[PDB]
Write a protein that binds this ligand. Structure first.
Ligand SMILES: Cc1cc2nc3c(=O)[nH]c(=O)nc-3n(C[C@H](O)[C@H](O)[C@H](O)COP(=O)(O)OP(=O)(O)OC[C@H]3O[C@@H](n4cnc5c(N)ncnc54)[C@H](O)[C@@H]3O)c2cc1C
Ligand SMILES: Cc1cc2nc3c(=O)[nH]c(=O)nc-3n(C[C@H](O)[C@H](O)[C@H](O)COP(=O)(O)OP(=O)(O)OC[C@H]3O[C@@H](n4cnc5c(N)ncnc54)[C@H](O)[C@@H]3O)c2cc1C
Ligand SMILES: Cc1cc2nc3c(=O)[nH]c(=O)nc-3n(C[C@H](O)[C@H](O)[C@H](O)COP(=O)(O)OP(=O)(O)OC[C@H]3O[C@@H](n4cnc5c(N)ncnc54)[C@H](O)[C@@H]3O)c2cc1C
Ligand SMILES: CC(=O)c1sc(CCOP(=O)(O)OP(=O)(O)O)c(C)[n+]1Cc1cnc(C)nc1N
Ligand SMILES: CC(=O)c1sc(CCOP(=O)(O)OP(=O)(O)O)c(C)[n+]1Cc1cnc(C)nc1N
Ligand SMILES: CC(=O)c1sc(CCOP(=O)(O)OP(=O)(O)O)c(C)[n+]1Cc1cnc(C)nc1N
Ligand SMILES: [Mg+2]
Ligand SMILES: [Mg+2]
Ligand SMILES: [Mg+2]
Lengths: 589, 589, 589
């Protein structure tokens, strides 16, 4: 007639679909874990080597479309180790339950061993943050923690004295509210707002669609609208998978982790259809400084008019809004604007393709991605870390909506890749998973490669060894009138992988890349976790946030040096393509 | 006539003796670092692979008697990575300056990239926590940060917008208050309080001295007092180096990370001289439940009467107090109490020595320490990690005041060892440094082994590979009516070390341990960082917090099993030694 | 071509409808206020005597259906004084912008006069909490503060260095996003969920509708449903105005601030239609312990299944849900259940009416309310303070949807009444406003009576002088086996009102109450603020949370004493009415 509180907690977690708990065992968590596996319960424990990797995996699990993740941290140091993963979830508004273990109740406030008040730890970023006051309410609080993490789209934190889960209660003294879980269906936009948008788009001479992840699942519709009104497409760094990598009108993304086309288009555009985005560089980089009209679509009222004055605001689902717009807007037969953009994009793709298809020489980022493109499954999942890998992956990977690409986009914590792969593979065990990592970030997390090995969750780690914290050093050449402290010694990551039970590869030449990738993938299909140590050059990826190509903006000397350093001799400034179509730059005089 | 704000900051840090900054480069920290090395400034940057290791090294640097440490974390993820190191410093009351990099001022509050309010992050544990409001006051705030960290004995945190250090100011618009640094000299205790202590000690039939780190530097005096009044000595887990490892009257420490003698003595004692300690298990483990009188010595008023009712309270330096007491107290010629304790200690040392000196078989903790004892320098420094290593090191290392032993004693974060070695070697470059680590903790920090290699700071890493998070699993056998999730796969750490430019060794047999240690030390003296992968058994160290040896407390079956499992056939319960001297247990009936 | 930042802020506030700022002038707020009134701006300043009254008025302004309120607090003490008002808004989820003045930027971090970090002050309860980093972004942050307070339904806090508002900017460097303000229209519920509800209601033998403020604006529909299926109605303490005070099937509210009928009905009910409520006593008072089925309607997913296991969960507007249910459910011709409830309600109304209509004697709460009922406008607004006034007002006021009743229901801060009247009168200048206050709460706020006088915002303060903190003392008789410290001396509040420029009245006899109220109202219509000092008895209002009337639950002695003390000789326990209709209590045996 009674049940162990720990088993009740597992039953509740199971009811909310939270069937995986990431973490490291602890005395302050013994009771909870001791209950795992009872009465046919299916909540599994995935042991990591560093609690931050567990927290990040639990979060990335949801990012990749998986179930609500749960992460545990032992009282004190275990709990504090969850921070980078929780801050990432908070900034990305991703649901995740964090359980902080604690000393038994009798020890609280006694200044005992590893005994402290952990309530302040995550109060600032959490949507729910409580210290269980007595054993009997633990089930209710775990249930609410799940409900709140999901409803508030954020981090739900519970501090749990270690002695509570051992307590027993009547089976009728607990319940799950998972059965009452309800979510709102996509909301249609106000016709009045769609019409105002249509009018502006019809009258615009240089329209451009800036699509954020709010357009996820509606890329075809966005591409259709783009072609109907001849409006080029700009995407955000988080939304590339939404488009066919080779879409004729895709200009890429603006600023640093972007493409040349996008950065030029935005400064020449008249009307922007800001769809489902909260682009953070908007104000500080003056992204929309030359735009005449601004139309925004978003399901969140707090975002309407946030990044720029909105001439038209549309509250509602991006899909529905795009569909309504597509159907009501006037078709455009030809546009000098569209034609110039297509050619500018084509020019950029020539540049990118020639870099990717070199046949011999010292290995660069480009050829590694080329190889990934020639060997990856069409529905491959990419877990991207922070640094040059982010910048290059969205330029050189050839994705489509069949893929998934995720990173730590806003908080931007390094080391998100390996955890990303764990959450992905846990969700899709038969799906090919890639972790694209810089050596600096890999260095903050490679001990967890063994986790994939131990749990038979085969992933392919691609490590870019340039022996520098490049993303910073590269920028140091600009912002810094010096440099200093951005390089380190190279280590044999392939050998480290072997020591961990993984399969390691080392490659440093372009002419060996295709074979190495072939062998790495074959190994992954043999059930092995792989680490490809790519010893690349220190060539800095082309900095499209500072395009030194237009002779009316930079000196010939500057242009020559820029072309030379970035192998961009054939890149043509957008103004040339505009003028060829009889148009004039609206800001370059 | 002007100076770069960044150079001013370095000059101020240099004036406070803070000549080393630990961290990882960042765009949000570029300005500050760019200034390092100018105008003959000698503030060096030590690059780590994970910011938590940098934060911990900066803290351990002071713990080991070094200069004020400085740690940097890039805005957001870099800063949050400092947490485990800062919480350790906070709980241990260790001075440390933490600089959090941040987006440029113009980006603050704009919800820009990696832009957030970091003030809440460490407000709870810091003694100083401010966000620089404008460039010109950065020097003043760094100066105050140093002054406050030192005066308040804690964490001083500054959030610094990345664009401030580039600003220039008049040389007369900044100054360091380091020249005004003043500290109080040891304060003599009130004679009235010393006399009350003396009277109690003179009249006590079973005195015992419980010495905490407040007695650091006065071990000889404590040993002299112990012999004068025939009072055995109990130490805290943090204070072993204060005594000669083989002192005839040293009973060790109480509770889990302790010895058998100490745990028995405390339950049989009448009067306790609690000198310079804030022992955290006092109340929750009922350490002093059978004590009749309690005398406390401490320089901190907040501690007087905290762990137990104090019959006599002495405010002042432990050295001075011990000296005053020693001189005024009556000499004791013989004591049945003393005699029984000495024999109980001798019995324990027989047990410990026989474990350490085995000649053949599967390697255990014991023989690794035996080897360390036979090959280490007499002034060696030991950086101890958290787990079975802590428990075993204080039982098997043969230290004296010439040594230094430090860990993460209260917050108890794993992974403190490697950082400890960095701070130690940075402070004493020609001194032998040992990092004693469990494989679980090593797994949270081994990527930083390369840091010692890269910076030519040779250390000896001793890794205990039992393929479990033993300290927890061991206790799981008691507290848990099950277990689960406490084991992992073994990895070749020696091979990982080689891949990092370090020298690796692997040992699994007792008969090879002496030679392996010899070769490891010789390598360390050759300037190499070493990793000794000790493949040990899963034998649980004897649990002295639950001594099942007295037939009046446990069944014969229990005693037999306990002796069998812990190879303690020859250990004799303290009550036998007491009775042999004509005394009776005061609680065992 | 340029504009003062302060004027820009006022223009933005005006665009969001925030035309009133409550507070007290300050050096740290001088710049902002100095700009009020410029270029035809219409943002007015309402000066209070205590900043907490200003914060509460700004909040109550929205509670009463007014515009977004703004409250200001001078750096340090002025800002901290806002706390009770902000916590009330936070717990009630009411939008409000709070501006904290601060020392000029140059003084920040200098430990200057009244200079401190106010970011921690309200971080825990705010939905937006930032310190303006530079003058130029102040406009953008005020605009976002308004947008966020509204979108997040909570407290938006901005700390503003006093020197920023003086700075000038280009008119094109600021904009308001108020034009993009959009809100979701009522969402229809899932038909599947409505049908499950209907089925349960059709099959229920004892249905009951528990309506919270989510049903606001749909009382007629709720009353119609109640009559159609013969389900009595229970309301929450915040939702009385939604029903006609004399609705035949209104049982009142459960627990302490409730009626006898409601408290009995809930323990005898089978199926509950929990509509638009988040009743806080649910679990701790076991409100639904005897209920068989539970159906919940709410627009917030986080609330579904929170207060009790939900057999049916309906996500969507309460109006739409009630309408769908009303139309699909089966009509019920007669019900023994309904009949018994109506008679129990009628019995309660006989009791209440006889108390209210006494003709002579010492004045009690009852006759004051009787008088208010006979003289108040039909659309009067009632601002209720915390204490016996809350308990009694919902029992003795005769409200309808034409009225508005508001208090501090969850955080429950005393002193909310006067601020409530200010916000109400500011919103509806020609509407009759009543402040019902206990003397204890009046004592925390009467200096602000002058505010109504000074700003010609005539209100009627009704003060219940029982010279005790009754709501507590009353309960002290139960929970406390003593009492102590709950009484104080009586003061002449009428005389205090006169000293403040208000009109004071004093009444202590039932036979004078009608005339006094008549004269008080006539004075209010003469444009004067009135204070009616009601010297009442210390008679404790009947405690319906402990009904000692059923002989099968209490001894005859207890019942006699209960009837005697609360003049309830004629109250009949519900079980009698149930049995008379051939039904049996489901829990009283
Ligand atoms: C090292 C690094 C460098 C980077 N560099 C760049 C860079 O140069 N350029 C760049 O663009 N990014 C860059 N990023 C990523 C960048 O920081 C942002 O995270 C990203 O651009 C935000 O993209 P977003 O607008 O698509 O989505 P979010 O910021 O997640 O916003 C999505 C919006 O969509 C709305 N929404 C959600 N669902 C719907 C729906 N159904 N209908 C309508 N609206 C909906 C939401 O309410 C929200 O407002 C970088 C990241 C890293 C780690
Ligand atoms: C995994 C793990 C297990 C552990 N297990 C144990 C265990 O079983 N048993 C155990 O004992 N410890 C154990 N520890 C260590 C333990 O948690 C405490 O940190 C330690 O015992 C505190 O020792 P202390 O009293 O010497 O010093 P502190 O707690 O640092 O207190 C020192 C006191 O000395 C005072 N003081 C300082 N200078 C002076 C002066 N000049 N004169 C006078 N007073 C002065 C201070 O004000 C303070 O009150 C463990 C640690 C870990 C990480
Ligand atoms: C001294 C004091 C004593 C008190 N004593 C009592 C007492 O004895 N009994 C009592 O009942 N109260 C009492 N109260 C008030 C009590 O504390 C609660 O604040 C009140 O009962 C909450 O009422 P509620 O459920 O209507 O609304 P709320 O708690 O405000 O919850 C309203 C719910 O409606 C939902 N909602 C909003 N709009 C819609 C919509 N359009 N459609 C559907 N759902 C919607 C919301 O999401 C929310 O879940 C007392 C207050 C004080 C100050
Ligand atoms: C964006 C940001 O803040 C970056 S990008 C970057 C370079 C990463 O180097 P890696 O070697 O992994 O990759 P590479 O650029 O390909 O060489 C650093 C150090 N940072 C700062 C930083 C520091 N520390 C942490 C934990 N997270 C971040 N994001
Ligand atoms: C004390 C405490 O909280 C311990 S002791 C311990 C076992 C350490 O295992 P390791 O393999 O390093 O050593 P071993 O015991 O010799 O096998 C754990 C997991 N914990 C919990 C824990 C978790 N995570 C972190 C960051 N710090 C701590 N202290
Ligand atoms: C509910 C709650 O917490 C109450 S009800 C109550 C009695 C109020 O006395 P008053 O004289 O105003 O009214 P009366 O009951 O009619 O005599 C007190 C002191 N409290 C505690 C309390 C204390 N202080 C403040 C600021 N707010 C509250 N709510
Ligand atoms: Mg790199
Ligand atoms: Mg281990
Ligand atoms: Mg009163």
């Amino acid at each position: 007639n009674k049940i162990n509180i720990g088993l009740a907690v597992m039953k509740i977690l199971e009811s909310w679909g939270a069937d995986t708990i990431y973490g490291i065992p602890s005395g302050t968590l013994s009771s909870l874990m001791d209950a795992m596996g009872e009465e046919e319960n299916n909540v599994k424990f995935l042991q990591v080597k560093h609690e931050e990797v567990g927290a990040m995996a639990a979060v990335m699990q949801s990012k990749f479309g998986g179930n609500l993740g749960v992460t545990v941290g032992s009282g004190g140091p275990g709990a504090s180790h969850l921070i980078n993963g929780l801050y990432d979830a908070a900034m990305d508004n991703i649901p995740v339950v964090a359980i902080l273990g604690s000393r038994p109740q009798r020890e609280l406030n006694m200044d005992a061993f590893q005994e402290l008040n952990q309530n302040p730890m995550y109060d600032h970023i959490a949507v729910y943050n409580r210290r269980v006051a007595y054993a009997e309410q633990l089930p209710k609080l775990v249930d609410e923690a799940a409900r709140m993490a999901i409803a508030k789209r954020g981090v739900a934190v519970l501090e749990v004295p270690g002695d509570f889960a051992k307590v027993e209660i009547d089976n009728d003294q607990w319940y799950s509210s998972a059965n009452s879980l309800r979510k709102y269906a996509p909301i249609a936009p106000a016709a009045q707002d769609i019409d105002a948008a249509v009018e502006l788009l019809n009258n615009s001479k240089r329209p451009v669609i800036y699509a954020g992840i709010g357009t996820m699942g509606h890329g075809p519709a966005v591409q259709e609208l783009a072609r109907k009104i001849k409006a080029p497409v700009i995407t955000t760094g988080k939304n590339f998978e939404t488009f066919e990598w080779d879409f004729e009108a895709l200009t890429g993304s603006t600023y640093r982790v972007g493409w040349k086309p996008a950065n030029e288009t935005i400064l020449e555009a008249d009307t922007v259809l800001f769809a489902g985005s909260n682009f953070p560089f908007s104000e500080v980089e003056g992204t929309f400084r030359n735009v005449d009209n601004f139309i925004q679509i978003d399901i969140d009222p707090a975002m309407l008019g946030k990044r720029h004055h909105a001439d038209v605001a549309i509250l509602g689902d991006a899909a529905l809004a795009i569909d309504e717009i597509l159907n009501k807007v006037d078709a455009v037969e030809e546009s000098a604007w569209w034609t110039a953009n297509l050619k500018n994009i084509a020019n950029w793709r020539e540049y990118i393709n020639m870099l990717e298809t070199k046949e011999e020489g010292d290995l660069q980022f480009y050829q590694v991605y080329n190889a990934i493109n020639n060997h990856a499954d069409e529905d491959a999942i990419y877990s991207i870390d922070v640094g040059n890998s982010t910048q290059t992956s969205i330029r050189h990977l050839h994705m489509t909506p069949k893929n998934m690409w995720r990173t730590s986009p806003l908080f931007a914590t390094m080391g998100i890749a390996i955890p990303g792969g764990l959450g992905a593979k846990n969700t899709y065990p038969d799906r090919q998973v890639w972790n694209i990592i810089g050596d600096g970030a890999f260095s903050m997390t490679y001990p967890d490669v063994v986790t994939n090995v131990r749990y038979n969750m085969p992933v392919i780690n691609v490590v870019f060894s340039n022996t520098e914290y490049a993303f910073i050093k590269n920028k140091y050449e600009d912002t810094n009138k010096n440099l200093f402290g951005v390089d380190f010694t190279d280590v044999d990551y392939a050998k480290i992988a072997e020591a961990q039970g993984a399969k390691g590869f080392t490659v440093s030449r372009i002419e060996d890349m295709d074979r190495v990738m072939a062998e790495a993938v074959a190994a992954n299909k043999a059930g092995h976790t792989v680490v490809i140590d790519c010893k690349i050059t220190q060539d800095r990826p082309i900095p499209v946030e500072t395009l030194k190509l237009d002779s009316k903006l930079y000196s010939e000397d500057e242009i020559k040096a820029y072309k030379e350093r970035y192998e961009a001799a054939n890149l043509v400034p957008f103004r040339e393509y505009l003028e060829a179509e009889g148009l004039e730059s609206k800001y370059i005089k």
